Nucleic acid binder design. Structure first.
Lengths: 149, 149, 149, 149
DNA sequence: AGTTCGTGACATTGTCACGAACT
DNA sequence: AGTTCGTGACAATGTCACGAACT
DNA sequence: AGTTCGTGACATTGTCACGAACT
DNA sequence: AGTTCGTGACAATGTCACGAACT
């Protein structure tokens, strides 16, 4: 584990997640009978501030089908929680026009690197384009002198 | 004005947005009293597919603040609704690393262009600088070949 | 007249020429009857050392058909007589193989000049061929340096 | 031995040469006495087309000196006789100015070659030097063209 | 040894065709 | 226009000097 | 003036697919 | 082999701030 896993903080996240899924209309419970599940949900609503308890609840009453998905969601939020501390470890979200993203994705795939890294290469290559043009004509002139001389 | 406003569709959107905000714990109503407020919330729960009525609610029972926000939320849901019918009108979400996004942003603001228009120029300016190292490598090869013969 | 015409000397030439034609079997006489001509010839044989007389003889008895030819032969011998004084005004006679003369004639015609002059140009061009080869490689090297540099 | 000796032909040649030399005032015979000498001259005048006899005369009545000279004269008339049957075996007579012939002779003696073989080398060595000013003018044009583009 | 033969290099002589110069 | 001249390019014939093979 | 609409720019949150690391 | 983690690439939804036209 690269990031530290704070039991207190994540249990709260898992709680909010399980609660959010419910008001969204999903099966947080593993129980099929609407009685044992209907209750498991009611109890869970109490665990709001009891971390240790939330972990237990999950073990007995949560739908096995949410197990991996939640592991993803919480895993990702953990990362994001700590990357938020310094700006160089943060990510920025932007939208690009379809066609523009397409040209950029193709580039990156072909070069074999990340979208970000590709953008950095583009910025550095595109900046030296001027120092390269003048490098062509300067080279093209010096040669024309080697001939008539 | 560009896209068309389908009253029927755009009304259910406005509804789904109210029931959602309320189930999330926000002041849908503009009545400080929990009496009049709760009174409205119940009605708005049966206006499911009665668009004719849904609007009546907004006009009569809606929180000032939420109104302005719902307005921008809908124009966005609209535009995206119609933009999703053709690829060259769709948008792609990506995430860049902070520092990489900053360098891209600096360029864009500098030139007054959008992030997509800036990626597009960088890609063309870089393809140009690349065609310069090529033509310089082609000339050294074309000339060098004739003298061997 | 560029060369001086010595009456004494040329009359002797004309005499020898007229005598040579006869022993060669020709009509030195203009006379068709073998009597007036047969005699004119006999007289001419006496003029051996009398120049002034030879001129007269020619006027009365020589075949009009030898008139131009002798003018050529004597004209040419005069030139040759004086060109023999200095070696730079002399001509030298040589034989060339058919094919060789042919290549040389073509050259001279095309350039528009004398066989001699053509031979001089050939000798001077063919001598500078070495200074021209080394002028090609030296030029071919200096250029290969302008490239890798 | 190369050419064939046509006794019939080569005999009349020997005859025409004797009657000629005698009509020119030379000692055809080898008899100091004008008696025996003139005796022979008369016989040799009827051997016109009797080759069988013509030779008998040479063996019996011919001036020593003239014999040796007639020998070289005939070998020449022979070789030319047969060389005139095909162009690439014929010879062309030209005249060069003295000084021009001298420069040509110097070269030939130097290289041990004949005058024709020397004209042939000069023509090839000059065509070579010319192909050098050409290739040097072609390269300056080929290179110069690529840099304009 | 001495001589034949072929051959390259000229010398002589004659012509022709061309164009400049003079009449 | 017609003629005289000088001239370049050959041809035709004769010699000579070599040099390699034939006697 | 005040408000609608379209729009570019992000922030949040959730997922998936991938591969390194550990068990 | 099975699982846990960090991670890059998106989607989907909501806001905000502009700016140009509609009221």
């Amino acid at each position: 584990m690269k990031y530290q896993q704070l039991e207190n903080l994540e249990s709260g996240w898992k709680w909010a997640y399980l609660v959010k899924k419910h008001r969204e209309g999903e099966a947080i419970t593993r129980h099929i009978e609407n009685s044992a599940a209907q209750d498991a949900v009611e109890q869970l609503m109490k665990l709001e501030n009891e971390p240790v308890k939330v972990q237990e609840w999950i073990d007995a009453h949560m739908n096995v089908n949410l197990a991996t998905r939640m592991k993803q969601t919480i895993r990702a939020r953990r990362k994001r929680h700590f990357n938020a501390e310094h700006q160089h470890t943060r990510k920025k979200s932007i939208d690009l026009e379809f066609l523009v993203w397409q040209r950029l994705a193709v580039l990156a795939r072909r070069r074999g690197n990340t979208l970000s890294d590709t953008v950095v290469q583009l910025i550095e290559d595109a900046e030296r384009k001027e120092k390269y043009a003048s490098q062509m004509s300067s080279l093209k002139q010096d040669l024309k002198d080697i001939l008539d001389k």
